Amino acid sequence: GDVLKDRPQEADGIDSVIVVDNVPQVGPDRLEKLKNVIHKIFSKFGKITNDFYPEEDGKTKGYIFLEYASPAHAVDAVKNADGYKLDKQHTFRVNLFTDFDKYMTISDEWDIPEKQPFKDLGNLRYWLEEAECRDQYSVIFESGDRTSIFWNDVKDPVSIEERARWTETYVRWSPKGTYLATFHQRGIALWGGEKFKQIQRFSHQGVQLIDFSPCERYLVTFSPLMDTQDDPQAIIIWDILTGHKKRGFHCESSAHWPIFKWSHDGKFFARMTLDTLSIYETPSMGLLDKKSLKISGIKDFSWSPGGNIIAFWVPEDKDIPARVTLMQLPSRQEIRVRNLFNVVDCKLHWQKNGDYLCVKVDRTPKGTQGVVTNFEIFRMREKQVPVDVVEMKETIIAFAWEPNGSKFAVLHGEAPRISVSFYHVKSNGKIELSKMFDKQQANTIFWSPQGQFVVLAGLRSMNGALAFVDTSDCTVMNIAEHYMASDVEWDPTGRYVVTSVSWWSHKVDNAYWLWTFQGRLLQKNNKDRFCQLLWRPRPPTLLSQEQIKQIKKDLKKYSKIFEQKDRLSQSKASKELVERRRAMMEDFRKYGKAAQELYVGQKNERLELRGGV
Amino acid sequence: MKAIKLTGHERPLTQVKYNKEGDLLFSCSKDSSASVWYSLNGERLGTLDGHTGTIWSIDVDCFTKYCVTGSADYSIKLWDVSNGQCVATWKSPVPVKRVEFSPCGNYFLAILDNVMKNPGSINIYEIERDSATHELTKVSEEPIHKIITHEGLDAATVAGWSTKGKYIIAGHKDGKISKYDVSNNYEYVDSIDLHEKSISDMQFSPDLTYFITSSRDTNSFLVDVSTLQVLKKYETDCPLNTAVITPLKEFIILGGGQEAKDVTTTSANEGKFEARFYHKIFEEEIGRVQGHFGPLNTVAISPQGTSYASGGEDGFIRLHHFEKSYFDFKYDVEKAAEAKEH
């Protein structure tokens, strides 16, 4: 009962006896009134057959014992309910007194056959062992009714597996490619191990969003379809290392996913209430400082890649003119605020290392127009966060930073084709316009992870519309097809571009297109009801000053050390039993040319290997 | 590939065929009605009813306007594909074992079996067609020519037309192939002696300039039309009923098998009559595709090379759609040579 250390037994004891604790305490009428309530509450398990109401040193009686003609109903009875509640402190607390034949002293404990980091090796390991020559792993929705696995073998993508109905909606990679997150409508699964099976699965239905912390430790699941799974905790956070639901947070209405945003380290997690920013903390998903930050009018918020900072912004809110705020955490201080004044919208673009925050700002004159776009760049390594005001120009529709660097590319509207502007860092300081190119169909700027190559893409156009630029000093290499292009992705090290046409987006061609950085198409493979393509992530495993030095070793001119040896190995792959088969192929092409000739001459017919359109 | 199973026929299959655009599949069996199926999903479009005997052969014209059937009931029928009605019947003094349209649809040949005292023959019929609608205007009750079993050969069992209808190629019950010159009043041109058993199938490449033979003697030969040179030999340990040349890829599909008879089959081993894929040029077995409960009697490939169908002595048709692993299947020297292009 009453003592602040007191509890019922923590497992079942002997089967036959009811122990109920913190009963209605003795006083006027209460003693016989206790029987009067007990023989209604406990009579639904069967009729009371013995009752024992002891007293102890003359102190008021906290517990009673009850027995039944069928005794083994008692083990159900103290499982069937606990906590049923009468007056005052009387909240009936149920147990069976201790076993005396069995004991709880030591067990066999707990096996695990394998865990998550094995298929991190089953990314890197496979990249070493496998013979080819020379690239990335997929990740294809489309060939056939199957979720399917491919390499990039230069000649074709070779298919490794095609698995029938693996996902019931969409399939998502883990950040290093370690797990595959597969949606099943009866619970999200993490498919692990080298040959792919479920190692972990999380029961949440109504889910459509299924995304990781960027450091692979936590999974966040969101149901836009309410069930009674959520009630009403629709944002559910699952810990991958334990395998457990750590939190649910109640549902949402605004805006784009992720609505709940992680820091880079995965230390902090947060969501906006419009009148208050709430900040939640790893490892247990607590509440930082035991507080939430009462700041009003926030229109979006973006975490820095650098430890540990949020950029957020407020438009004109009643008494408050518009501003962009840089806030440091866990201190929670608005370290750099700049009021921007009379803005239709703004977009907050971090550089990839946290070095700079560029803000794209659209300002309003008294005619109520989006008259001019400005670029204003905060510098975060530099003392007291100085600000590069850079640009003034008409209708900027896109902006993108150089990955891992400091250059950027910009698109302007209404000329009447889209104009492209290119920006570099000056040796005297400041970042400034350096080049432009004539107006085009490109609406999307998509840069290589290796910094040099930028794609200018007219996504969701029937034709053309992909243009390719090498950088520094931005020079156009190539322009190519992709009929009804929707989807676009790069190799993590910038060698290959893949672009696709999802059947969710478009239905006049449906395909994936695979292309080498140069201006050489590898292949385009039409696919019958094409759903999706995603490369498996492959981060460079370690990086260091000596690796950065080895990259500079040949000083710039040409080099001839590696590729010529791989081409020599490929040249060896045309030899030894190979020669007889090369001869066969040849003899066949010749036989065919001979008949091809004769038929053109004799009856004017062109031979073929498939029935023409 | 993915396979689904079409059931309609309760009797052993005798022939399956795709149409020119590869969206319909036609089949006949030892039942007296033929079926038409959508090749996309295996849905049954309808049936061809009117024969009273096994239908041995079915063919569909290049327009998909008519199909023709040959029957054990001693008749050939011409059917209108859009309503399934019979528009012409010819009576035969003997069963008809095979029928095929000329490449442009104005003639069909029919193999008349050598039964009772008939020596057998390949009959050629003419369909005069409206040049716009390709509907028929006239059929004659007589064939316009009869190639009677040539002196020294046994009766023909299979026949087809080469490119532009300039030759008829035939296979015979004594393992020979013979060739007839259509311009020159179908005169005998030449023959080769290939198999120790009857020729059980013969099918053409997509351009009709070469063909592939099969026999229950376990061998299959790829043969050039103009020379009758044998180009390739595929050697098996299995009696063959049927064979095809694939479009798109350089593959051959062969099919046959030996009925089990007296030996017990376990549930683990049930459903293992297969089609064998060979590389056309290297003559090497590259795959076996299981699924049938008795010998394969007929195989057909779509002209787009994107699916194939097989019909079994088990009374089922398995319909196969190729997947990405099939389209990308390549020997190392084939990857090399395809890249040498650029």
Distance CA B111, CA B118 (A): 12
Within-domain flag for B164 = yes
Domain identity same for A363 and A252: no
CB contact under 8 A, A144 and B323: yes
Query: Which DSSP symbol is given to A493?
Result: T
Q: What is the DSSP string of A244-291?
A: EEEEEE------SSPSSEE-TTSSEEEEEETTEEEEEETTTTEEGGG-
User: How distant is the alpha carbon of residue A389 from its chain centre?
Assistant: 33
A271 touches A257 (CB < 8 A): no
Angle of the A578-603 helix axis to the B332-339 helix axis, nearest 10: 60
Structural domain boundaries, residue B208: 2-260+270-339
Nearest to B178 by CA among B240, B244, B111: B111
Q: What is the pairing mode between strands B230-235 and B219-224?
A: antiparallel
Domain identity same for A386 and A407: no
Within-domain flag for B194 = yes
| CATH number for B329 | 2.130.10.10
Within-domain flag for A255 = yes
Q: Write the CA distances from B33 to B25, B76, B109, integer angstroms.
A: 14, 13, 21
Nearest to B315 by CA among B36, B24, B28: B28
Q: C-alpha dihedral over B85, B87, B88, B89, to 10 degrees?
A: 10
Domain identity same for A518 and A489: yes
A392 touches A374 (CB < 8 A): yes
How many distinct helices (H) and strands (E) make up chain A? Answer: 6, 40
- Partner-chain residue, chosen from A525, A574, A611, that has the shortest CB–CB distance to B206: A611
Within-domain flag for A82 = yes
Alpha helices in B235-301 (DSSP H): none
SS3 B207: coil
> Residue B295 is encoded by which pair of tokens?
């010998």
Beta bridge partners of residue B296, listed in sequence order: B312
SS3 A597: helix
Buried/exposed code over B210-224 (b: 16+ C-beta within 10 A; e: otherwise): bbbbbbbbbbbbbbb
Within-domain flag for A48 = yes
Query: Which DSSP symbol is given to A101?
Result: S
CA atoms within 13 A on the CB side of A104: 7
| CATH number for A255 | 2.20.25
Within-domain flag for B333 = yes
User: How distant is the alpha carbon of residue A151 from its chain centre?
Assistant: 22
> Residue A612 is encoded by which pair of tokens?
């023409």
CB contact under 8 A, A598 and B335: no
SS3 A557: coil
Final residue before a domain boundary, out of A259, A280, A313: A259
What are the chain B neighbours of A609 within 8 Å (beta carbons)?
A: 205-207, 247-248
SS3 A117: coil
The resolution, in Å, is: 9.0
Report how this structure was experimentally obtained.
cryo-EM
CB contact under 8 A, B335 and A156: yes
Beta bridge partners of residue B29, listed in sequence order: B13
Distance CA A530, CA A520 (A): 23
Domain identity same for A420 and A537: yes
Number of structural domains (chain B) is 1
Domain identity same for A415 and A528: yes
Distance CA B60, CA B57 (A): 11
What are the chain B neighbours of A150 within 8 Å (beta carbons)?
A: 324
Q: How far is A592 from chain B (nearest CA, A)?
A: 10
CA atoms within 13 A on the CB side of A186: 0
Domain identity same for A298 and A389: yes
Q: Write the CA distances from A210 to A147, A237, A257, A263, integer angstroms.
A: 17, 10, 10, 17
CA atoms within 13 A on the CB side of A256: 4
What phi and psi values does residue A569 have, to the nearest 5 degrees? -60, -45
Structural domain boundaries, residue A79: 17-95
Q: Does B328 touch chain A (CB under 8 A)?
A: yes
CB pairs A-B closer than 8 Å = 90
Within-domain flag for A571 = no
CB contact under 8 A, B323 and A159: yes
Within-domain flag for A411 = yes
Within-domain flag for B168 = yes
Number of structural domains (chain A) is 4
Domain identity same for A450 and A378: no
What phi and psi values does residue A548 have, to the nearest 5 degrees? -60, -35
Q: C-alpha dihedral over A569, A573, A576, A578, to 10 degrees?
A: -160
Distance CA A42, CA A27 (A): 22
Distance CA A457, CA A479 (A): 10
| CATH number for A25 | 3.30.70.330
A608 touches B209 (CB < 8 A): no
CB atoms within 10 A of CB B278: 23
Q: Does B64 touch chain A (CB under 8 A)?
A: no
CA atoms within 13 A on the CB side of A184: 14
Domain identity same for A215 and A312: no
Within-domain flag for B265 = no
Domain identity same for A427 and A515: yes
Q: What residue has token string 């069963």?
A: B95
Q: Name residues whose C-beta falls within 8 Å of residue A613's C-beta, 6 or more positions apart in sequence.
A: none
Query: Which DSSP symbol is given to A464?
Result: -
Distance CA A411, CA A458 (A): 12
> Residue B28 is encoded by which pair of tokens?
């006949």
Q: What is the pairing mode between strands B156-161 and A197-202?
A: unpaired
Q: What is the pairing mode between strands B176-181 and B187-193?
A: antiparallel
Q: What is the pairing mode between strands B145-148 and B121-129?
A: antiparallel
User: What does the longest C-alpha to C-alpha distance in chain B come to?
Assistant: 63
Q: Name residues whose C-beta falls within 8 Å of residue A549's C-beta, 6 or more positions apart in sequence.
A: none
Distance CA A122, CA A114 (A): 13
What one-letter code names the amino acid at B120?
A: G
Distance CA B194, CA A537 (A): 57
Nearest to B107 by CA among B153, B151, B72, B61: B61
A337 touches A326 (CB < 8 A): yes
A67 touches A51 (CB < 8 A): yes
Q: Name residues whose C-beta falls within 8 Å of residue A248's C-beta, 6 or more positions apart in sequence.
A: A230, A233, A234, A235, A236, A237
Q: Write the CA distances from A280 to A187, A273, A289, A381, A383, integer angstroms.
A: 25, 13, 9, 27, 30
Q: Does A83 touch chain B (CB under 8 A)?
A: no
Distance CA A328, CA A336 (A): 9
Within-domain flag for B307 = yes
Distance CA B52, CA A167 (A): 50
Q: Write the CA distances from A231 to A234, A282, B169, integer angstroms.
A: 7, 24, 75
Nearest to A581 by CA among B249, B281, B45, B187: B281
Distance CA A563, CA B180 (A): 58
Nearest to A306 by CA among A334, A267, A272: A267
What's the burial of A539, exposed, middle or buried (CB within 10 Å: 0-12/13-18/19+)? middle
Omega within 30 of 0 (cis) for the link into A343: no
Sign of torsion over alpha carbons A26, A32, A33, A38: positive
B9 touches B15 (CB < 8 A): no
Alpha helices in A475-577 (DSSP H): 545-550, 563-572
Domain identity same for A530 and A414: yes
Distance CA A567, CA A564 (A): 5
Within-domain flag for B23 = yes
Distance CA B240, CA B219 (A): 7
A323 touches A342 (CB < 8 A): no
What are the chain A neighbours of B209 within 8 Å (beta carbons)?
A: 595, 599, 607
Ramachandran region, residue B165 (left: φ > 0; alpha: ψ -120 to 50; beta: rest):
left
User: What does the longest C-alpha to C-alpha distance in chain A come to?
Assistant: 123
Q: What is the DSSP string of A455-514?
A: EEE--S-SS-EEEEEETTTTEEEEEEE-TT--EEEE-TTSSEEEEE--TTT--SS-EEEE
Within-domain flag for A33 = yes
Domain identity same for A453 and A503: yes
User: How distant is the alpha carbon of residue B133 from its chain centre?
Assistant: 27
Final residue before a domain boundary, out of A487, A509, A541: A541
Nearest to B120 by CA among B112, B110, B132, B109: B112
Distance CA A126, CA A118 (A): 12
Q: Does A580 touch chain B (CB under 8 A)?
A: no
Distance CA B237, CA A1 (A): 85
Distance CA B109, CA B172 (A): 15
Instruction: Go through chain B and tell me how many residues it has.
Output: 342
Domain identity same for A252 and A234: yes
Omega within 30 of 0 (cis) for the link into A398: no
Distance CA B52, CA B301 (A): 28
∠ CA A230-A236-A242, rounded to 5°: 125
CB atoms within 10 A of CB A480: 17
Within-domain flag for B185 = yes
> Residue A234 is encoded by which pair of tokens?
């629709």
Distance CA A581, CA A261 (A): 57
Sign of torsion over alpha carbons A65, A67, A71, A76: negative
SS3 A420: strand
Q: Name residues whose C-beta falls within 8 Å of residue B312's C-beta, 6 or more positions apart in sequence.
A: B12, B13, B273, B292, B293, B294, B295, B296, B297, B318
Sign of torsion over alpha carbons B18, B24, B29, B34: negative
Within-domain flag for A87 = yes
CB atoms within 10 A of CB A82: 13
CB contact under 8 A, B325 and A588: no
